[PDB]
Amino acid sequence: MNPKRIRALKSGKQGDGPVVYWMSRDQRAEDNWALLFSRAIAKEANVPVVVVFCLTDEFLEAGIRQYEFMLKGLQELEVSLSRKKIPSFFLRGDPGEKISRFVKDYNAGTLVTDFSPLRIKNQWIEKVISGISIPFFEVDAHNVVPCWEASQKHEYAAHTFRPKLYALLPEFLEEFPELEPNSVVETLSDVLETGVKALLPERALLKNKDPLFEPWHFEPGEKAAKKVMESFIADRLDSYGALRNDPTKNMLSNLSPYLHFGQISSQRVVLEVEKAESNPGSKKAFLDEILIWKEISDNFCYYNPGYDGFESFPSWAKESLNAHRNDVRSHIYTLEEFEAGKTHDPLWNASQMELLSTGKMHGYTRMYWAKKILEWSESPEKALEIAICLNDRYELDGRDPNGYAGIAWSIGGVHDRAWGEREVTGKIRYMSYEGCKRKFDVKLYIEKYS
Ligand SMILES: Cc1cc2nc3c(=O)[nH]c(=O)nc-3n(C[C@H](O)[C@H](O)[C@H](O)COP(=O)(O)OP(=O)(O)OC[C@H]3O[C@@H](n4cnc5c(N)ncnc54)[C@H](O)[C@@H]3O)c2cc1C
């Protein structure tokens, strides 16, 4: 029970005592520090622990692919907490109004939530703090090392973040204790049914009204995430290092949709991967992606209020892009062309079809996809929102600190360094279609997504 994993955001007087855990980001029962810590305070007060989830009004800003994935895993989650004598309540509405009412109605004693550096979470926390008098606590249940503990400021390079993270690995890379059960708001399927009816008009469709999304690639839920983790270690971890940059090969862990929704703990993945015997290069490469690059995204969003804006770019990148803002662009595409994949480049939209159909673009093509948006945009700011809009609308792992950090990496050179000067893009790292052809079978990738 490491105390550096928990932060106090509001102090007050404890009420009746029924610890309420406001699940937001980590939607799992196993390997949850916030759930464990909420249980960790329960016995000291001789009171039970409850779980509350909020179905916010912002779900209409996304698609059915993400709403279905979250709700189906929640359905499996509800059964899991019931086996541990933990009741879970699902509230629909603004968290500020619902959580404040629930705390007063249930006479809650202590409130616990999981950490998320996104702006919308800080928006919800602000309203809840002004509407409650019980103590408010938050726990970083998403990062191996707590975000405030890994670094106390913004890190502008991975080389400056890796030694800090690895130095704190021995203290925080530990095994999860078992979740002790308790000593002793109408339906979830109904709220799913009415939700999709509201998102039906905005469903992505093909020419013949055939829906574009294919939901058989990633089964949601805590159970399915474990099998994905087990399959990756047994079959794909050995060749991960050599084939990670090949979109034509399915050699990735495919863990981001579960990681984003908190359906599986990243710490659990690190634990099993570390024990696994594989190629040392592949293990190091995967550990770099899930430890350094994933958690530096939390660092980027936590220490930059404008993480989704041009203001958070490095100084060299802002001046370079500002100097090339007046450069004539080869082509300009609006949001409709980018969304429908109607660009002259056949590689770019081929990634878009993969994003539209499967809901998870390949890691290598996602770099090319976002950088071409900067090339074909009227301004870097326009490319920022165009990339953010498409990413947060169609990616299953979207609306995540990994997304905004990754977009900032591709467009603004965040966590990168200056490269050869070029028109339009300035000193931002360049990715050419010819360069892609020398790295992997572009034609095979294009044919698979037509
Ligand atoms: C422009 C752009 C936008 C992105 N938007 C998102 C997003 O909205 N949501 C999202 O989860 N990821 C995003 N990524 C980061 C990364 O591409 C994905 O995490 C990864 O592609 C997801 O598939 P995977 O888990 O099978 O990859 P794996 O090769 O299996 O990597 C394992 C884990 O490491 C993490 N990771 C891998 N690459 C990165 C990275 N470049 N930055 C941070 N963490 C990483 C992921 O959590 C990943 O699950 C984005 C990348 C780019 C270049």
Collapsed DSSP state (helix, strand, coil) of residue 213: coil
Which of 279, 309, 339 is where one domain is finished? 309
Let me know whether 148 and 277 are in one domain: yes
What is d(CA 138, CA 206) in angstroms, rounded to the nearest whole number?
43
**Cα–Cα nearest to 394, from 58, 64, 74:** 64
- The reply to whether 111 and 220 lie within a common domain is no
Asked whether the beta carbons of 36 and 176 are under 8 A apart, the reply is: yes
Atom of ligand 1 minimally distant from the CA of 257 = 11
State the Cα–Cα distance between residues 411 and 184, nearest whole angstrom: 53
3-state secondary structure of 236: helix
Query: Which is nearest to 172 in space by CA: 146, 137, 142, 151?
Result: 146
Q: Is the CB of 288 under 6 A from ligand 1?
A: no
Solved using = X-ray
Binding site membership of 269 for ligand 1 (Cβ less than 6 Å): no
Shared domain for 180 and 111, answered yes or no, is: no
In this structure, the residue with its CA closest to atom 18 of ligand 1 is 363
Structure tokens at 293: 């690059």
Most distant CA pair in the chain, distance: 69
Which of 141, 166, 184 terminates a domain? The answer is 141
Q: Are residues 130 and 149 in the same domain?
A: no
State in Å: Cα 262 to ligand 1 middle.
Answer: 14
Q: Token pair 């990243």 is at which residue?
A: 266
Q: Is the CB of 289 within 6 Å of ligand 1?
A: yes
Tokens 């968290």 belong to which residue? Answer: 95
363 alpha carbon – ligand 1 mean position (Å): 6
| Bridge partners, 53 (sequence order) | 23, 90
- For residues 378 and 449, state if they share a domain: yes
Residue 32 Cβ inside 6 Å of ligand 1? The answer reads no
Same domain? 192 vs 279: yes
Q: What's the CA-to-centroid distance between 256 and ligand 1, angstroms?
A: 7
Closest ligand 1 atom number to CA of residue 232: 30
Instruction: Indicate whether 116 and 41 sit together in one domain.
Output: yes
Residue 293 Cα to ligand 1 middle (Å): 8
Rounded to 5 degrees, φ, ψ at 172 are -110, -15
CB 188 within 8 Å of CB 90: yes
Q: In the chain, what is the straight-line distance between the N-terminal and C-terminal CA atoms, in Å? A: 51
Residue 237 near ligand 1, beta carbon < 6 Å: no
Sign of CA dihedral 304, 310, 311, 313: positive
Is residue 418 within 8 Å of residue 427, measured between CB atoms? yes
Crossing angle of helices 401-412 and 380-394, rounded to 10°: 150
Domain that holds residue 199: 142-309
* Six-digit token string for 92: 């629909």
Does residue 289 sit in the same domain as residue 314?
A: no
Number of domains forming the structure of the chain: 3
Resolution given for this structure, in angstroms: 2.5
Q: Which of 269, 352, 400, 402 to mutate to test the pocket of ligand 1 (most atoms within 8 A of CB)?
A: 402
The CA 128 to ligand 1 mean position distance, Å, reads 31
Tokens, residue 62: 């996304």
Following CA atoms 269, 275, 278, 284 in sequence, which dihedral angle do they give, to the nearest 10 degrees?
60
What is the three-class DSSP state of 302?
A: helix
State how far the Cα of 379 lies from the Cα of 411, in Å rounded to an integer: 11
371 lines ligand 1 (CB under 6 A): no
Distance 327 CA to ligand 1 centre (A): 31
Locate all alpha helices (DSSP H) within 238-277, ordered by sequence.
Answer: 240-243, 256-260, 266-275
Residue 139 CA to ligand 1 center (angstroms) comes to 23
Residue that is last in its domain, among 109, 141, 173: 141
Residue 232 and residue 353 share a domain:
no
Does the CB atom of residue 400 touch ligand 1 within 6 A?
yes
364 within 8 A of 400, measured Cβ to Cβ = no
In short, whether 299's Cβ falls inside 6 Å of ligand 1 is no
Q: Are residue 216 and residue 286 in the same domain, yes or no?
A: yes
307-317 b/e with 16+ CB inside 10 Å = b?
Answer: bbbbebbbeeb
Domain check: are 394 and 305 in the same one? no
Question: How far apart, in whole angstroms, are the C-alpha atoms of residue 388 and residue 370?
Answer: 9
Tell how far the Cα of 403 is from the centroid of ligand 1, in angstroms: 7
- Among 397, 399, 431, residue to substitute to test ligand 1 (most atoms within 8 Å of Cβ): 397
SS3 assignment, position 444: helix
For 349, other C-beta atoms within 10 Å of its C-beta total: 23
Do 227 and 263 belong together in one domain?
yes
Binding-site annotation: residue ranges for FAD: 240, 253-256, 289, 360, 366, 391, 397, 402
